[PDB]
Amino acid sequence: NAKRGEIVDRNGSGLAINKVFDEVFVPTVAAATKDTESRYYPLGEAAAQLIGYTGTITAEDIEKNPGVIGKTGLERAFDKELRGQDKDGQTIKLTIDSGVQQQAFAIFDKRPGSAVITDPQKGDLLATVSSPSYDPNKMANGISQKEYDAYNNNKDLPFTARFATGYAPGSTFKTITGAIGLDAGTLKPDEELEINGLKWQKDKSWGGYFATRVKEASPVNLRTALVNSDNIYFAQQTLRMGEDKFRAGLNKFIFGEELDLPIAMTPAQISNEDKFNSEILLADTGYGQGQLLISPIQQATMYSVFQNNGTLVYPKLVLDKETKKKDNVISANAANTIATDLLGSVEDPSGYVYNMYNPNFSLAAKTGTAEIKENSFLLTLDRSNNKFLTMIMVENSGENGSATDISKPLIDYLEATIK
Numbered sequence: 001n002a003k004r005g006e007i008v009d010r011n012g013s014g015l016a017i018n019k020v021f022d023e024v025f026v027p028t029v030a031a032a033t034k035d036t037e038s039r040y041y042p043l044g045e046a047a048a049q050l051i052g053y054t055g056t057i058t059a060e061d062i063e064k065n066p067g068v069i070g071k072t073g074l075e076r077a078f079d080k081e082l083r084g085q086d087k088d089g090q091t092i093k094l095t096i097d098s099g100v101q102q103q104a105f106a107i108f109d110k111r112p113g114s115a116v117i118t119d120p121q122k123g124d125l126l127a128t129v130s131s132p133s134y135d136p137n138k139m140a141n142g143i144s145q146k147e148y149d150a151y152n153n154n155k156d157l158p159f160t161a162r163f164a165t166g167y168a169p170g171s172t173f174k175t176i177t178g179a180i181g182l183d184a185g186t187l188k189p190d191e192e193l194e195i196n197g198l199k200w201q202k203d204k205s206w207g208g209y210f211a212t213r214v215k216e217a218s219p220v221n222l223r224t225a226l227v228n229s230d231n232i233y234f235a236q237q238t239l240r241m242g243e244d245k246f247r248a249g250l251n252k253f254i255f256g257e258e259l260d261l262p263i264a265m266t267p268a269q270i271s272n273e274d275k276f277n278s279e280i281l282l283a284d285t286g287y288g289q290g291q292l293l294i295s296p297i298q299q300a301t302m303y304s305v306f307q308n309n310g311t312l313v314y315p316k317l318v319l320d321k322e323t324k325k326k327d328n329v330i331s332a333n334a335a336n337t338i339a340t341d342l343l344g345s346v347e348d349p350s351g352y353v354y355n356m357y358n359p360n361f362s363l364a365a366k367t368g369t370a371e372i373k374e375n376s377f378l379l380t381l382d383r384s385n386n387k388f389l390t391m392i393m394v395e396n397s398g399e400n401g402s403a404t405d406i407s408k409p410l411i412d413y414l415e416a417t418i419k
């Protein structure tokens with residue numbers, strides 16, 4: 001009987017450890033009584049999808065590769081290192097910070113959504129949160145059929161790891177579209193484009209389709225369009241760029257690329273085919289619509305270029321793993337120009353993230369709402385020290401509110417701890 005290896009956070013705090021209990025004769029916590037060692041998760045629901053839970057080796061388990069075994073999450077993906085022999089399992093230290101993990105999970109409060117917080121210059125995943133969640137301690141050490149069925153019958157599906165699920169990125173994708181337009185030469189950041197009305201189309205060939213916007217602006221430049229959430233500006237800049245210049249910039253990212261993370265995840269895609277085959281879809285992809293499917297972990301990876309002078313860093317979950325990058329995904333001037341203009345989302349009183357304004361901290365942000373019901377997104381960038389990046393989403397934002405409405409405790413926590 002060898003002890004299973006432990007999973008600890010970046011500071012050594014236990015994420016999946018062993019603890020002896022007095023159980024109520026074979027094993028609730030106090031027939032008979034005996035001191036039995038049990039697999040314990042201190043963060044509970046806050047890290048349930050990431051860490052996973054254990055279970056007994058079933059018949060079909062040993063029927064593949066010849067008392068407890070990882071059934072899901074990192075407890076399953078890291079089983080060979082944590083199981084050991086009968087040699088104690090080794091301890092695997094992650095990049096997670098327990099303080100940030102419990103902050104990101106607390107802001108949702110049963111709301112469906114996800115949140116990832118990274119170190120945009122190292123790739124360290126400080127937190128990967130999916131809501132709603134479940135009790136991993138109950139699932140591993142005996143859960144009743146009343147709480148299991150309560151989890152299965154939940155229409156929001158608490159078992160799914162939403163940080164590894166592909167969604168449409170929303171208007172936050174304009175940051176990439178605008179940066180590609182800058183390096184292409186077609187998008188001048190200071191030229192004033194005349195945009196009139198709340199709807200726009202290229203010509204009569206679009207028919208009953210229009211690019212719609214919210215706030216009416218008179219001449220819209222790059223900085224104003226990002227703060228005003230103007231779809232028409234980026235649509236016109238996408239049509240001006242052409243399918244080739246736009247796809248040339250997008251292909252420098254990690255689309256269709258499998259990552260070395262120990263989290264199962266479908267690679268990000270641009271569209272179903274190698275070509276757009278239309279022009280309304282080219283405009284849609286310009287402002288985050290179309291057939292884009294990027295996961296929160298992949299979204300945090302792509303957007304890391306703005307805090308590394310255009311260099312993309314890959315996400316890492318194990319601490320001692322070497323930092324991997326993809327150099328020159330966008331220019332340094334393009335990354336800095338977009339990151340500087342995004343300060344207006346927080347600092348401008350008319351900005352949509354002005355509720356999080358802090359005069360002693362530079363925070364660039366960008367909102368986004370996608371129609372799939374509608375989901376809300378929020379990307380924030382530490383421009384004071386480039387030490388954290390957030391990607392927060394809330395599913396069914398028409399009923400559960402926007403991501404900005406609940407993310408203020410999270411952002412305030414990071415600015416004081418990670419700084």
Ligand SMILES: *C(=O)[C@@H](NC(=O)/C(=N\OCC)c1nsc(N)n1)[C@@H]1NC(C(=O)O)=C(Sc2nc(-c3cc[n+](C)cc3)cs2)CS1
Nearest residue numbers: 168170171172214229231287288289352367368369370371
């Ligand atoms: C990018 O996200 C854009 N989104 C859309 O065009 C889509 N839906 O619009 C929802 C109304 C859409 N369909 S599919 C898909 N993938 N995306 C723009 N991004 C923004 C944003 O979050 O800033 C939205 S919502 C918005 N709401 C306000 C507002 C209005 C009034 N008041 C008092 C305050 C705030 C500004 S923007 C739409 S467009």
